Amino acid sequence: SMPRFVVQEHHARRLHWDLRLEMDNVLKSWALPKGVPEKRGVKRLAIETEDHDLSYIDFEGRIPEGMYGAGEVKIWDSGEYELLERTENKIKFLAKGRKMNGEYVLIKTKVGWLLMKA
Ligand SMILES: [Mn+2]
Hints:
- Zn(2+) binds at residues 10, 16, 18.
- The chain is an all-beta fold.
- It has strands at 4-11, 15-23, 26-32, 43-52, 61-63, 71-87, 90-96, 101-109, 112-117.
- It contains no helices and nine strands.
- It binds manganese (II) ion.
- Residues 10, 16, 18, 31, 69 line the site of manganese (II) ion.
């Protein structure tokens, strides 16, 4: 296998979370400066970032300084997910994490992306 996701907590120059979905045979990724919404209706900024390799889904450790993406990476949540809807502008999925669970949607508009919880 079932597709999986991870939410990494990344202690870089700006502390953020990274949501990564196994999708298109890579990790489709978004930075979340304020984290995953944990309550219904809350709208969080999501910043599309470059695809990562599938192997990276289980990574934890320190990205060294001078490297782009420096800082400590820790797994905040992880699990399977079920894809419910997808287009170039919308991804709706059921997350099966310990913290991030139930349905969520990533929304692309002219201003970028948002992440929202059912
Ligand atoms: Mn990051």
